[PDB]
Design a binder for this molecule. Structure first.
Ligand SMILES: [Cl-]
Ligand SMILES: [Cl-]
Ligand SMILES: [Cl-]
Ligand SMILES: [Cl-]
Ligand SMILES: [Cl-]
Ligand SMILES: [Cl-]
Ligand SMILES: [Mg+2]
Ligand SMILES: [Mg+2]
Ligand SMILES: [Mg+2]
Ligand SMILES: [Mg+2]
Ligand SMILES: [Mg+2]
Ligand SMILES: [Mg+2]
Lengths: 316, 316, 316, 316, 316, 316
């Protein structure tokens, strides 16, 4: 049941940004570190029991010389095609969602499902500099340069760069999408790259961290709480929250300049409604938030229609 | 974690059939009652945000003059096409799985998602003769003529009759599929109709009721137990179990004479592995059972590949 | 523990009525449909190991030609007797509570325990016109004429009509009582019939639906939520809530003209305190609400004393 | 769901008696200590809202000069009457079940609901000699002389002595009954006193302690386990089990020589079926055990009928 | 997660005292009853695998001639030594925490861990005058003179008296400490005895009872709620809360005249933050409350440092 | 409650070793890689509120140039001293257990609490080559060279090398200890190094992986199962199990040639008794296994005494 701010308060919830003074410089230097690594994209054809599509394993190199991979599915016909980069949930990829990628291609989109470094298939070359609570949320959290989501966000940008370089994709008709973690990555990618034409984010994660750790009732935001339990110095908490502020999509949101479609379920206890309204209310672009009273952190059939209609409009 | 018979015992588990002497005659007479109702199919176009497919709402008349309905999606190209009738889980259809139906059409199959009477969209004209435990499992359970699944099984047969009558479907290349309740309906359809060429049943429900009510740890087999708690006469329990034996797919399985592909997860607490192995082991036809150690009553990615390859082989 | 409005706010909680403009006409037409069915009451004597009482199975015909039944127990002595119609909880009858009915008779009341159509023993002839979430709460919810509780409320009225027709009952000394669903039926019956002399309702269900589905933390109000999950159109939700408004006892409450005794447990999560205070605060008749801080949705021993004292006063 | 020995093994389960060589002498000496305390019964009228019965608060003195009390209800008619002493569940009396006691009187029985010392209303003058786990189960468990149930069992015997001394009770027609702890007290009373003519014990507690602490899945047998965790010397465990063996009803059952009716639900996790079958199988007297597949540690409607019929037969 | 008053409201939460007019007289008479019992301390040496310490079982006589005991560990060197009396959690002593007592001695403190009468090792001679809910919280709760914590508080005072009488302890350098129940005992002892020089209380229990029973989400404050369920008269609740008021440390707090160090975890559901801030805010002495956002009712490593530093300062 | 093999079967449970033919060579080569990294130990004093001890933060370099650290506490007196290396539980170190380390020093032992790379304070320089399930258990599991526990086991060996090099430690009297993951590290250290004189392992983790993943009911063995769900190729499962067999302490145990003391609680659902008995039964050395019926995966007081007495005997 309902548990967060009531809808009327959610609609006006817009916390002050927490971006440090060197927020832009950190992202600039981070993109510059990415650019020093040659992508060297590699496509390996893959058998799949469906006609009308060609499937591949796509691998490229990214931040920290990390090998990143995923399924890439293309309509079996003359291009150029509209394209989608799809990002997945936290610890929530099962053999890379190949069937979903094929279905996207059958809807007419050349689609790459980036697999998140350290979670599924893709390599995380970044070390564990100081020890962390169980999970990825606090890996390297004592420094922006070492934080887990630095590499992840840069990988998400590189995925767009790679897909746009292909002859069979129409570089002008590329979308980004995903749910929860995948939703955060969607907003981060649109904030950090000119490439995407449109974005659809399902109940995005990695937003309004300061509120998230006080309101969430399930994992994985509570890993942050677990880390503070195990590393109890007051200074550690201040540093950790500062680090998180560089990756908080509510702080990246103002950079987004493409149309955005977003969902939230009002009984969602993983990505609490307030945290999602926070990101949405910091967007200054063509946008729409679809609110679903009786849904939580889960597939919403009605939003699937909205998502398909939105990409059909902006990408075809 | 593991809980049913160990694998080596599952593989040989073949309970004695519980079909009463008038089993066949019951079904013959039930099919005769269906035949008296003219199908009178009606198709209504649906505006759906996808190319390559035409989407409809299909409605027809069935047993007891009931109005049964569901989404029907068709490849947007000259037929005739291979076809699929897809059946859904107990209390588990959310606006009829329209998106899944479209995806099946984009994989090349004219596909109808039959919606189960009284659960989702479709009408259940059968009354509640005697009072039942919360749910549909014990609705009319005191008589085979009034039992809930009588009308459901007949609707499932009528769905095939209707689809195979369409000009754009290749009547010789029709598949049936579904999971849990949907898997039970798949097996029941193939057993009660010559129309299906092939069948894929995910962890089928409605099997080996006698063991199911003693071994299941989750709903909905346990509704039967709930009914017995509320209606405790010993004669009532015997009568209810005999009713159920007419619908038990382990008793119908000997009629199936098309290829069958089936799945089971070994930690499945809803449809316990033993109940699924019982239906499987009562099949005498080309068959395969895919066993997944680490999965329960849920989507199994690896099995979707097998499902697609199996329909590719038999319908194309 | 405490979870709803604090007591001081509960005592003044009186939501605006949600009755549509044709509320009275719908009930008038509904009672007229009931009157067209001849009751044809039938009494079958029953063995029971107690002296001083005569037990029967009573059956009568009601709305939609439905066969309704229950245990009827009478003091074994010359009448006429004061009488009680007792209504049961949702899915909560176990072989009709025969022992409780006998105890009521031994307290000197000719007592009939109406069994709810489709739940226990009694027949529900009303169909499932459109499909519903697991349970009875959303059966026929898209239309007042087809809604499950239409037949149920009319049955509850007919029970009074039948009991009052008996030579051995004093038609002027008839009470109604029940808990949760049985409590709602108690208030509905007193609202729809002149027959009852007094009413005792334990934490009544079927009240203030709009608040109920936002505040309840257990079944069965949440079936409504489940239905909206499975049938997601905005228009479906509006229609469903309109339908419910005709059956909402907070809307029927003003019709009650007999003394009413009511209970509420402040930690009740099934029938939340606010929903019960809502019904109570809409009564304009001799009334009393007994509030129990440390009880939830359960038998309250202290209220049993109050109930017995209340019926002794008004019916003897 | 099922969990103890299967039925066919329960039926023959007869653990070797664990009674120490001084078992009889302990009980003889304990009864001698009771006899030294003059009962000095006191009856105080109670205003209760029912006709046909007179209600009292009965108080008497027992083992250790303890003040034991409970409701005593009597038919409002010339006696002498058949009588019942009713015993209650562990920590499970709510204001002494006055309403149930009245109902027993209206069924024709002069009935006293003995309230257990230290649990409800009654005084426990026995000290806590050595410290115990949360609860009464391990209070004084290091010595048979100080153990909690010594005084309780003696109070239960004294309740019968007191009731049988009343002019209005037919001393030759006295029953004992109760469930769980109440069932254990029922068997213990019949074993320690010649006064009861008949006994009905619902799923009796305080049986086969050695198995109980290994098989029970719920409180309160598991208090014993909790005590052992808190007092881990091996000598302490041996001594505690030996203390318990003096009170284990499977060791007392061979003394019962009146008709016995007993119940067990096969999913009962509080008093596991094996523990109940052990007491039953140690009875050598007219006996019956009613087994209910679908019930646990709870009210069984069908068994109430058997209970009433059984007392009708033996007390009337 | 967070559940009580927000921190800013906690810091100013100071409920009106609930001490009856004869509060001081009751404690005066209670201490006078204690003084009539000669302590007769007895020390029995005990083997323990550690050098640098001497271990003993200490036993003394207290209120109601009760035998109270515990482990007493002394540095193996010439005294006099600073000393500590350590009090334990409710039902939370496992063989008296001998290892912890030895560690205190190895930190240089002659340390006695008083074991709570009736809970662990120590005798409770006080009777159960009226019956209580499962546990100790409502034992004797209908009268201040009979209430369980009367004897317990007096034992805690006597422990100080005994330890201060020893040649090897510096009577001027004695501390008291404990968690939850042990924390309440710490504050009660400092309120009732001049002996302690300093106090460290971890999230103290037995505070602000009126709020506790409305806010706590786990045992054992909810035993009070359980008692009111089983003993439902309004007068019983008033009496019980009056009794509790004499033992409420928020009422004893003003008597404390030594430095106090206290902890609270903001997600603590056993001793809710409000109840602990209530006691703290009623202290008028040198004091400090350490607040831990991410901890509940559990060991807090950072507070262990604070506790050690505090006793080192005040006792060495 | 009980759940693994019964005790009589545990005592003889000795699974066949799963060590591959290159087991020894793997470990020899791994130790050679460690040896190439110069330890370069650094001690930094820490202000701690206790007399009789000097506290430090110890840091050294290990496998993969990783910075490993922990608290090192030493008796404040002329050495040389007996020493202990203490290893901690999975994800279970809270600021490195500084207080426990001090207590070990006050018991006379120069004690270092090695903190596990990537879990607490210590650096894990090993990458995530292929993606893993949430946790460390499946990090690098597709290759023995990259697996998480390779570096951990080598750090544990290096901790001993470092401590034994200190002037104030008696190199001939060094112990190892720890629980669960810490117990597994204890056994692995004694197996891979001649330095330890004695070992005490509480309910050791990382044993008999093949059974563990089928019998464990709690985290963290079940991460392996989670990995298999997310990476379902049959070849992946075989490879992962073979990797694990290099680290399985039941395969290392045959190398341990110092006295061993071990514990197991029979209700332990984390490290099931069978997995612990398997490691124990593969020991060929002076050994003892203490079995605790009533305890699970938790602090066992009685075992601490055994632990202290055992180190007293072997190190002093
Ligand atoms: Cl890290
Ligand atoms: Cl029915
Ligand atoms: Cl319906
Ligand atoms: Cl005791
Ligand atoms: Cl008491
Ligand atoms: Cl990895
Ligand atoms: Mg190909
Ligand atoms: Mg190009
Ligand atoms: Mg008769
Ligand atoms: Mg008449
Ligand atoms: Mg000594
Ligand atoms: Mg002195």
């Amino acid at each position: 049941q309902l548990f967060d701010l009531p809808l009327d308060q959610l609609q006006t919830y817009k916390p002050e940004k927490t971006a440090p003074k060197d927020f832009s410089e950190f992202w600039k230097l981070s993109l510059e570190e990415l650019a020093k690594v040659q992508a060297e994209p590699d496509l390996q054809p893959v058998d799949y029991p469906a006609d009308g599509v060609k499937v591949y394993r796509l691998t490229y190199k990214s931040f920290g010389n990390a090998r990143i991979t995923g399924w890439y599915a293309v309509p079996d016909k003359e291009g150029p095609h509209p394209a989608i980069v799809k990002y997945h949930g936290y610890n929530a990829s099962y053999d890379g969602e190949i069937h979903e990628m094929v279905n996207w291609a059958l809807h007419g989109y050349a689609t790459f499902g980036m697999l998140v470094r350290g979670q599924q298939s893709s390599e995380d070359t970044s070390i564990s500099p100081h020890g962390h609570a169980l999970g990825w949320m606090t890996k390297g959290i004592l420094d922006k340069d070492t934080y887990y989501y630095r590499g992840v966000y840069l990988d998400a940008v590189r995925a767009l760069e790679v897909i746009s370089s292909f002859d069979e994709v129409d570089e002008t008709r590329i979308g980004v999408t995903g749910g929860s973690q995948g939703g955060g990555l969607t907003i981060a990618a649109a904030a950090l790259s000119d490439i995407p034409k449109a974005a659809v984010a399902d109940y995005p994660y990695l937003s309004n961290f300061e509120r998230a750790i006080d309101v969430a009732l399930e994992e994985p935001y509570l890993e942050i709480n677990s880390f503070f339990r195990r590393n109890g110095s007051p200074e550690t908490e201040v540093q950790a929250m500062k680090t998180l502020s560089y990756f908080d999509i509510m702080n990246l949101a103002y950079r987004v300049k493409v149309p955005v479609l977003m969902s939230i379920g009002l009984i969602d206890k993983v990505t609490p409604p307030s945290t999602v309204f926070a990101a949405y209310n910091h967007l200054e672009t063509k946008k729409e938030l679809k609110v679903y009273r009786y849904f939580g952190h889960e597939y919403i059939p009605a939003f699937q229609t909205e998502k398909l209609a939105f990409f059909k409009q902006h990408l075809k």
